[PDB]
């Protein structure tokens, strides 16, 4: 009793809105289940087999994407300037963090 | 003497599609994916609603709601009547046998601090 | 002669005797849950 | 050194398990103890 949506649909040649109107938006829809399918692909678990490893990659690619979009002619975005300032300050901070410990010796 | 109602809740064995190699156990709730521990937006709400039971009523404040700390644990009556008719799946038997043990054991270290 | 050798010999041998005795006394017990074979133990190892 | 490492891992894992899952007690024991009584009885108590 109280079946899920995956035993309900059984057909996947359609658009999302049709299925919405046919299974979840009908007045007679019993809607008596909540079960989120596992969407991670095995072709990705076999290489990143750890939530920490799946999060480090998910953050590295996020940083890459945020670098690529900010690097017709508007160019007047505060986020590009913020990323530039952050990169410059990070470079200048690591600069005075290796030399400072070179001096202390 | 027994504290609040947040440290006595039943199982609520909803479901999970994640392998046991990943799932973690947040106290007070069931067993969820591991990604729910690196997200403070959840691991700071599911943990504050627990310790909001150990806190006595003389320490919630001065105008905090009669029965509970409304600023943390309050659901409108419409939302309570709406989530009442929400029903999760049911855990598989071979999976509910150890899930209930993990749940009621990760909670014992709280019903044990409330006594010491 | 001194009473050292036949005392330290016993004191040393008793440890290994007890270890080999505990290794074989538990094999004959009630329900054994030997987990040296791992068909489905990786999940419960990584979770814990 | 590789044995000291495994012993340290076992001890710290047992401590953290006693701290997290308060249900268990986990008396970390050794089989070399428990010398025998009057005759053929060893009475190994619970533990790991
Ligand atoms: Zn912008």
Swiss-Prot record, chain B:
Spell out the disulfide connections: none
Q: Where in the cell is it found?
A: Host nucleus
What family is this protein classified in?
Belongs to the herpesviridae TRM3 protein family.
What does this protein do, in the record's words?
Answer: Component of the molecular motor that translocates viral genomic DNA in empty capsid during DNA packaging. Forms a tripartite terminase complex together with TRM1 and TRM2 in the host cytoplasm. Once the complex reaches the host nucleus, it interacts with the capsid portal vertex. This portal forms a ring in which genomic DNA is translocated into the capsid. TRM3 carries an RNase H-like nuclease activity that plays an important role for the cleavage of concatemeric viral DNA into unit length genomes.
Quaternary state and partners of this protein?
Interacts with the terminase subunits TRM1 and TRM2. Interacts with portal protein.
> What is the protein name for this chain?
Tripartite terminase subunit 3
Organism annotation: Human herpesvirus 1 (strain 17)
Curated annotation (Swiss-Prot), chain C:
Signal sequence span per UniProt?
A: none
Give the superkingdom in one word.
Viruses
Report the locations given in the UniProt record: Host nucleus
Sum up the protein's function in the record's words.
Component of the molecular motor that translocates viral genomic DNA in empty capsid during DNA packaging. Forms a tripartite terminase complex together with TRM2 and TRM3 in the host cytoplasm. Once the complex reaches the host nucleus, it interacts with the capsid portal vertex. This portal forms a ring in which genomic DNA is translocated into the capsid. TRM1 carries an endonuclease activity that plays an important role for the cleavage of concatemeric viral DNA into unit length genomes.
Query: How would you summarize the oligomeric state and partners of this protein?
Result: Associates with TRM2 and TRM3 to form the tripartite terminase complex. Interacts with portal protein.
Q: In which family does this protein belong, per the annotation?
A: Belongs to the herpesviridae TRM1 protein family.
Q: What is this protein called?
A: Tripartite terminase subunit 1
Tell me what organism the protein belongs to. Answer: Human herpesvirus 1 (strain 17) (HHV-1)
- Gene giving rise to this polypeptide: TRM1
From Swiss-Prot, chain D:
Q: Which domain of life is it from?
A: Viruses
From the Swiss-Prot or TrEMBL record, give the protein name. Answer: Tripartite terminase subunit 1
* Quaternary structure annotation from Swiss-Prot or TrEMBL: Associates with TRM2 and TRM3 to form the tripartite terminase complex. Interacts with portal protein.
Q: Source species, please?
A: Human herpesvirus 1 (strain 17)
The coiled-coil regions, if any, are none
Q: Where in the cell is it found?
A: Host nucleus
Span within the parent record: 680 to 727 of 785
Gene this protein is translated from? TRM1
Q: Which family does it belong to?
A: Belongs to the herpesviridae TRM1 protein family.
Q: What does this protein do?
A: Component of the molecular motor that translocates viral genomic DNA in empty capsid during DNA packaging. Forms a tripartite terminase complex together with TRM2 and TRM3 in the host cytoplasm. Once the complex reaches the host nucleus, it interacts with the capsid portal vertex. This portal forms a ring in which genomic DNA is translocated into the capsid. TRM1 carries an endonuclease activity that plays an important role for the cleavage of concatemeric viral DNA into unit length genomes.
* Signal peptide extent: none
Binding locations of ATP: 17-24
């Amino acid at each position: 009793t109280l079946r899920d949506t995956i035993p309900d649909c059984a057909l996947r040649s359609q658009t999302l809105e049709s299925l919405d109107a046919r299974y979840v938006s009908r007045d007679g829809a019993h809607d008596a289940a909540v079960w989120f399918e596992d969407m991670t692909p095995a072709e990705l678990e076999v290489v990143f087999p750890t939530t920490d490893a799946k999060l480090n990659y998910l953050s590295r690619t996020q940083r890459l994407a945020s670098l690529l979009t900010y690097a017709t002619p508007d160019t007047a975005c505060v986020h590009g300037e913020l990323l530039a300032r952050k990169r410059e300050r990070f470079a200048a901070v690591i600069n005075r963090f290796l030399d400072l410990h070179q001096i202390l010796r | 003497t027994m504290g609040g109602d947040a440290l006595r809740v039943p199982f609520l064995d909803f479901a999970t599609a994640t392998p046991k190699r990943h799932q973690t156990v947040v106290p007070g709730v069931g067993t969820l994916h591991d990604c729910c521990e690196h997200s403070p937006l959840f691991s700071a709400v599911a943990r504050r609603l627990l310790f909001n039971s150990l806190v006595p009523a003389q320490l919630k404040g001065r105008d905090f709601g009669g029965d509970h700390t409304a600023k943390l644990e309050f659901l409108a009556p419409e939302l309570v009547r709406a989530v009442a008719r929400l029903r999760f799946k049911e855990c598989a038997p071979a999976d509910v046998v150890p899930q209930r043990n993990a749940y009621y054991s990760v909670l014992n270290t709280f019903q044990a601090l409330h006594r010491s | 002669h001194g009473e050292v050798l036949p005392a330290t010999f016993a004191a040393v041998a008793n440890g290994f005797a007890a270890r080999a005795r505990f290794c074989a006394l538990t094999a004959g017990a009630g329900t054994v849950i030997d987990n040296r074979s791992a068909p489905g133990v990786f999940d419960a190892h990584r979770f814990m | 050194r590789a044995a000291w490492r495994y012993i340290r891992e076992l001890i710290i894992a047992t401590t953290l398990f006693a701290s997290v899952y308060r249900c268990g007690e986990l008396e970390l024991r050794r089989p070399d103890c428990s010398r025998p009584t009057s005759e053929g009885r060893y009475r190994y108590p619970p533990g790991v």
